[model samples]
Target: NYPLSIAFIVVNEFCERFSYYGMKAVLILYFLYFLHWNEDTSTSIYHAFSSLCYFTPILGAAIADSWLGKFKTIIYLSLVYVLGHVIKSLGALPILGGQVVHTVLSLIGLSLIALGTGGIKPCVAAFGGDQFEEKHAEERTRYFSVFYLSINAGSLISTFITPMLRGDVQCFGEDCYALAFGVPGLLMVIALVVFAMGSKIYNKPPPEGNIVAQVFKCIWFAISNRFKNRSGDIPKRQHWLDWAAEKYPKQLIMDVKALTRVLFLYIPLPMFWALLDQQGSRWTLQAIRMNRNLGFFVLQPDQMQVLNPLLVLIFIPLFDFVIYRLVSKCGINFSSLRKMAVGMILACLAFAVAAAVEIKINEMAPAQPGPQEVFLQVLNLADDEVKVTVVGNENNSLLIESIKSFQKTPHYSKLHLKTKSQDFHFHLKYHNLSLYTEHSVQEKNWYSLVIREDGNSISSMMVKDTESRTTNGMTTVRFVNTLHKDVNISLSTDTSLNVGEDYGVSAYRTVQRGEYPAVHCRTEDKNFSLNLGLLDFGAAYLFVITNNTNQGLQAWKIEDIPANKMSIAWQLPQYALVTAGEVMFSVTGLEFSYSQAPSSMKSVLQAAWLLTIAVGNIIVLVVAQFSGLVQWAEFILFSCLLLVICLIFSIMGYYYV
Candidate 1:
């Protein structure tokens, strides 16, 4: 009951899927950080690449059947695939490529990958089934099931390994994106070697000479002949396509009809893929906006997608062995079409919960000042409470004892600072005062005004800048001096963290987010310390520094960019929904195409399904084009879209023969 030849096929499937998925797992992030593109720009280009991979199957299928044959097609194109990843990995090496060189190299390499991968797609799957004896149908289904397990299990393994390689390890004085790209390329090479080593025992299928093209030709012949005899002069038949009876064999015509009969049912599936594939692009981007505290360990934003394949691995069996049996016993027909409709409903439900999660994400998402505005904060150290305003707006006021965090105001070409408090003789010692030499604020920036008075003298200096979030997701923090002279906080114990440069205000220090012991500080003489709570992921902090009369250096922190408040685990339910939906929709849809298609037309049907996935990515590309719209609005719209597709699918099936 076992086939040793099948051993090579499953291992090759695992290696190839590992190579493919591992390579792609970090591609979205590469676009964001390395390529320096905008959010949607990253999404758009990523989807375009994905869409290209799916669409190229048309040419892939044609080349396989008409010329190279599946065996030669899988081998030759996979070598090309191997070469393409090597180029992509090399291009991303920091020492070699620049903005222009890097982008060009990546694009060219991606195109070649799309070509090789897509062409190999249909041929490889079909070629595996070709190895079994035609009469050993039971073993074929069993082998295919094992093949499916290998693909997911391999892909699942890659999701964790690649993200860690890219993020946790450093290379080229940065996050090891080069290592990440190179590792997958290495896997692809291994996959090629492993597959090639199985040459002696594997099946070799000869070229079928484009049965897909001939089917189209037959359809066209029937149409043209029907139009030519269009009149009362000809005898009528039950079907118009039977008009080709004189020119084509009945069996050939019947096969063509069956090929298209199920294709009509294929109409609703691309939308399902459109929603599902976003786990790589739109959804992963959403992952970045939330927190990754698993409590035991920090999770990378890219890591959330690991939940998806995990859900599939567990649920595929749970649904098949348990859910299906329960349904059938309850007297439901449990038909394939009904299963698909149920799948679509689950997908719609996935998006609905997805929209709700996005709503929470939006609520937690922080917005810095707009391009036409200024972000200003006040630090008062005059040993008194003070009132602050942007000069003229009576309502635009802040009362502060130590520090007032960032506040937004219009970026006036000319402005005045007004301060009023109780100790004023109408204007003195920051009681009632206007400071700064007609300070003109730059739009879209952070500014800190450090106000201080030492027994006799009172002064304020403008130390303006908020260090933005780091590329690798560390927090940015700096000291704002309340004392006039320069202060340095030697961050000992964690000596490898960062050192500061001399300034009235210190340069930003980059730190990984976690709880820390007290950081001892000094101003060339007086030594004291500041303790910190859990530092936030991807936030910018302002450390207010002061030398207190209590013989200690004191510090308080103001968060400029607040920490992610929504936990990534919040995204789990929706992921569960979508993966469950995929089990029902994708698993059934694929089997349906195989069973419904004429034996000669299986590759063509799979290609058409793949093309729908391509169209789905293009659908995302189009949707991603709308800039800065409420993110949840789009999520909700897609939710509604899937529901509509499901409704249409159900309607079409009920009326369908």
Candidate 2:
């Protein structure tokens, strides 16, 4: 019966965790990249959404402990969890009628996640532990260990599998993400059903008394009879503290000397998290910027996030072993507080390693060249160096021009010449570039038309002598035909170019085109177009690499990077940093952080961690709001305040132990 109960709890937990992670991994990508929002807007929204999921568990834990009781609370919250899953599933569905109506649904889904996660978080663990009979103290101790392990095991599996499910959206579609989230809703239903099945085996413990009721009683007495409340046999302040000390019997509650000392601790931890939480977001963006190609297949930036969970799984055993070894020799020495201290220090170092990644991103020069422009200082190019080009004839009643040197033969599509009058338009059929020109004269204008084909993909229509004028009364029009099936363009005029007769047909040439690759983003194999795949992948791992489009990156005046070469640049650096951060942060910090909490309190710890994440997100929100209004250096300086606070607390904890 105990085993059945535990199994039910594990299944519920695994499914919920899986759903949460799956939704989390892609929320920013969908908002920022696919939707084309700026990073500040995307990240602020992402953090707020994600942190809410984490922070709500505190409220849930309090409710579970006091009012609803564990079983009823879990049952009620499971429904909430299911609702959240459904909301997200619908959010991932493609927009209908080319209209996106996701804001309301997305909010509903996020709220559901918060409700479910917070409500059930503390209850499930406490309820699971309740299965063990304290009368059999020794066995109960063992049961406690197994119960805790089970909680982590559920988390481990979810962490590993969740990212994979999230990745499925890329391979499959939004519908696949819907399925990913929907499965969890079904599992939650199953978990509730299974929990109900073990109604007899599980210990239905009486709910803890409501402290809020007692506090209200005190408040009412004080208001009703100001001085008389104290005189009317009201217990003294010390008496209330004494009652709490005896009732709770925990070391923390007994220490009435320190009133909520842990409250101050919460502040620093959340600030630390603001910096740390970047692992899956901004850090992943950076990693995606790095070259992610590891020989055969390129690793997705978000996929780097799996490293954190995987490391957490492995490190669980490693730390468990270390704790066991320490206790066997030192005895009760591995206090929860000590472990938290070490975790913070380790987490700090992990971020320091991440900062190294930032350095790498910073150092990365604009390796790809920008748009080409000539240096007038270097050459002082004269008429001989220039190519006077001609298109229409002087007497032809159209723009005319001539080319002299013709350093390189016109490749037909490579030709780029403009008529003096701006009345006539020129097209490079091969390169797909265009120029426009017009003429205003009593006599006809003629120029040598040495250029090649028309537009590479679509020939322009020439209306005049070629065809009857349109209803607008313009000249006749015809779409030019060419050797290449894709090529199309048309020249307008009464006649073609006659270069020799044109007067003062002069032209200037400038060629300082930078070296930048122009590889077609799409190839024959993958048909989806302009390769939204690369952009998708880049967006997926966006946390690590700041998008090149950001006003921040553009602030550097990064010139037009050749569309092709920089795409390769983005693929590498961004992925590497994120992968490394994910592996290190999750394993060393989260494992120990989670371990430090009591089995019954584990979900609270999860909530607390997430709360800290919320605080961190709030910090980012503040940072984003201020980043635009103020200089970036000010924001960095402000972020340093949290860093100092985290380090100080970390150092303080070492001495506390």
Candidate 3:
């Protein structure tokens, strides 16, 4: 056993996994909340990034097998990995610039990371296996076991830690993401140093003379010559690859045959990954909507991902020592494929449980915004100053002296107070009140202006006064553009708002003026004039802004006012299911890929297995848009798809031996 050398490599893997998983833990949240992209956009970009990360492993594997060899390939790609992490850290720094700048930098960083991470992944494990001799077969087996254990141990630690850094601590601005991303960068640097330290003792395998290229050439020759043999097949070639034996080495032909056989098993495996990877996207998004109240300690949505690696650590040991041994002792043939099929079934059951949890969440989730707690404030419009005394439901009473406006409520309030005198009346009831939840605290109210105008020469115009109140009892001001065409303009408490193209005003929540501080509106442009109007607060209060030039500017309303009451625990079942499936399918698949490959092409075959993961992620991107089903239905659909694929995979696996 090359303990000293393997020690350095395993430590390197630990740190590398820490950095990778730490980054992954917070990446989707960074996209959704920080970048302000919608759910679909964020999830799409996430899967795309993940897919690209896996795809570049092929490049890494080819380079290792063809020219650089595993050691050199790992060292060079590790440098790239460290650089990518550093750049990603820089992109997340608050001082860098605006949203666009941060987004562009993140994209560049992620691209480099994909290249760096994917390039070295296959090489690392194969390099560790190369450390042992054939006579020490038990040591080789133990090496893989330790290597996989290190991966989970690292993931277990980082997934828990990074989200805490991102949420609990304030390292930069309001978000702690600076430290969240920076810690990973530091860990990667350590991983590089640890890997390099192993170079002196490593086996350092030399290049294998372009094995991938030769395989391609042999395949091309076989396909090209198939028709020439025709009818009786001229002495009947045993295999199609045998047709290329004259042109290629026997060893190369045998390698291709072994690779082709394993490649067939690769087909259905991606569907498993496609479902499993949703832990990062769909499940995390679901967590955001659910309650995080864990009684003792509140869990952040991103932090919930820790369940996967944590369970992996526990299940790996349990299965290997207790579960597998128990099965073998019972006189059962518990093969790898059979184990994987059971894992798939378990994964399906997990989703089924998740669907049940979701049904509960859906039932409890608030369908509409609760009633507003109106804090009535009046702007005097009468001829003489007069005292206003109002009284209404639930012992609600307000006495206002002359020159004194309505006293501010400690929290958002609803009094439904009325006046006895006909001389005094209310003008803007919606603007005077504040919206509230179960408690008296204010709630979020997102506003948007939908306007349509018809004119040939008109270039642009702005909404003159469209300021509003926010949940924090703070003033959120905006002067949005209502330009020449029909557009939906949204207002946010933050400096940034979702100012994209209109997709109709289907977003939830309603806002009345009394439930808020104020709503003032006027068209601003010399070319487009506004009609003279006195917005009355009483005597059939009607507030309308019409253009003298045209009547195309239509409706405007508040959106995104609804709240979710679902518990975060609702996501646990799904997370548990997919991760259990991961253990069964992914862990076994890795062993299967390495075992089936010829000695000469281990890394190449490993890269091919990883390519299946890339294809699975790509499938998510392809199928995501076409999905019109509800969330629970989507979960069920994926589980059903996995069941069918698992059945097919089991049949193929059974026959392969």
Candidate 4:
């Protein structure tokens, strides 16, 4: 019972979703990396753009279902989307525009892209269904499944490919975002070209012309009449909107009545999307903190999200054929509302899983300096035994020339040093380091003290150091030149490093976690190196060098920050859980919307559905901007939020017809 043009319609959908998702995968990153926006602003703009696109569908639905047909509306909006792709592609090039122009062009391009993308979103889904007759309803239902299959297929395609163009293809001596954006934009052009070729065979239905505005005005008149006439004791009609039948016919007012009932239930549905969209934001943020070590390949944060998209590909058909049928075999009806309720319940689990994951992430990462205690690690660079007392901690120690690891010692105010080298006899007053001090010193910190000879006098340089948190699985390396000589360095890869003399502190370099087995160093004096036993993921190392008494060069591998052992594969389980929810809630919900809609106003009905998604994205912006909750707390709150929404929705369930 399939129509001839349905293949063309499906192909057009595949291409459109490909372009939309491919471009979106890199959208926030482009703002942060290319445009140099802050983290908050970049994600803010990302959600804002999404909200606008979803909101634009009202106009799209109105113009298509009322003024023109879905086919005509899609082609026109697709052209605008292609134009946006062009502008966005040009904006990615650093050479063509300066910083401001690049930003300006991207903003304009995104707005246009939003309009085009949002305009067609309802149209594409609705238009594909329009091709079928009443007799082909079963095939239409099956086609929707295939429609979603095409969507996730495009998702996997874009996810696998676009990031390569962005990171791997270097242009202008940096990431080639121009090519990354170009390929998707070009795919949009192909989508439109292929769509128009099948124009003759489509089931071109004529629009009723301005049906949405008629519905709007009719409702307004009913509201105004209800208010104005309520004081006059006008007897109640069946429903308040039924009063609209006086000026407008019963037929017209009834469509609004039918549409309004579904819209009433739509209120709680936004919570599902709020949790779903977080996959791109908070969920990926969680992935960044955990180790992506799968043994077979080094997985990235975005790549892990593609796992959820692919899950939709796998779970949908299985649910349709296996799970739903299995339920039916039990002699129970699997209603749309029931499936959606189960979906939201699944979201509860995903968020709770995410919250627990963060619990481990916080504990395993090196604990922040706490307990009002200042951390001090002093290295005896002197050849002679030294005497040192850190004001009431570790006093009366025997002197020795043997080198060992300096453990972190927590201490309080005032330090008296009687170094066999130092009783240069200086009594030092410690800065309470915000350890409840009335004067100079901050406490939320760590200190590294290196004892050395300054012009033949024993002295110590108290350098405060901080820890570096890794987003990728990279180990940090820093070299300090105590010999007042510049030495070059290298790792597993050929890397250039020059730490100059006079207590020169080299900048921390984050490198790939791989085997070097040694830190290769060379200077004007001669070439020498030291053995690096091994490295752990997300750990930082400080190398202090000035030529050893035993060998030509000496080293200290101090662990400033410890490693995070939480595996990223743990993140995938939640993805698997939520993917089932998406199929149950999102897919079933869309099918439910169409099932309840009237023949004349189905597109407007979709616009109402689209609005919930738009508002759902705004919830992300609102929570981040106003509340500023901790990531763990945010996940906790969302799960709790969906929990109540699930309950209230189930109550409405008993009341649902």
lDDT-superior candidate, 3 or 4: 4
- Report the C-alpha lDDT of model 2 over 1-657, residue by residue, as the tens digit: 445646666555655565566566656655654445677777777777667765666565665668567777777777777778777667756552111556557667878777777667656755766676567676655554555445445545544555456544444442245554565556566666766776666667777625423433443443445444455545554344444444445553443223223434555666656655655566555554554434445454465655554554455455557755777478675544544545444444555555554554546632321122110000101112222222433324222223332122221112122332333333222223334322221112212232322223222222111101111111121121112222111111212211111111112111112221221211112211111112111111100101133221110111111111122233233234333333333444454444455434444444455566667767766775556742224324434555577577766655532
* Best prediction by TM-score: 1
Q: Which pairs of residues collide in candidate 4? A: 433-442, 433-443, 484-501
TM-score of each candidate?
A: 0.86, 0.60, 0.71, 0.83
lDDT for 133 (candidate 3) = 71
Better candidate number, 2 or 3, judged by lDDT: 3
Model 3, span 1-657: residue lDDT tens: 444757888899999989998998899999886888887788889999899998866665676557777788788888888888889988888788878789999899898888887877777877887776767888888889888989988888999989888855654665757789899889999899988887788568898737666677788899778757565646657467878987888888887887888788778778877877778877787776576655556676789988998888888878778878888898578855677777778777777777777678778854322234223222222223323334333323333323222122222222321332111121111123211111122222211211222232111111111112211112122222234322332222322222222222122122211232222222322222222222211111212222224544332221212234566776767767778778876788788777778777765667678888899898887666567678888778877888888889888878976
What local lDDT does model 1 show for residue 328?
A: 85
Error of 3 at 175 (Å): 1.1
- Prediction 3 global C-alpha lDDT: 0.64
Lowest summed lDDT window (length 10), candidate 1: 419-428
Task: List candidate 1 stretches off by more than 4 Å.
Answer: 1-3, 224-240, 366-368, 383-438, 453-455, 465-472, 481-503, 514-539, 544-562, 626-629, 655-657
Tens-digit lDDT track for model 1 on 114-213? 8877877777777778887758888777777667777889889898888988877775645768888788788888888888887888658789748767
Candidate models: Cα lDDT each: 0.73, 0.45, 0.64, 0.73
lDDT of 2 at 335: 42
Error of 2 at 28 (Å): 1.7
Looking at candidate 3, the ten consecutive residues that score lowest on lDDT are 457-466
lDDT, model 1: 0.73
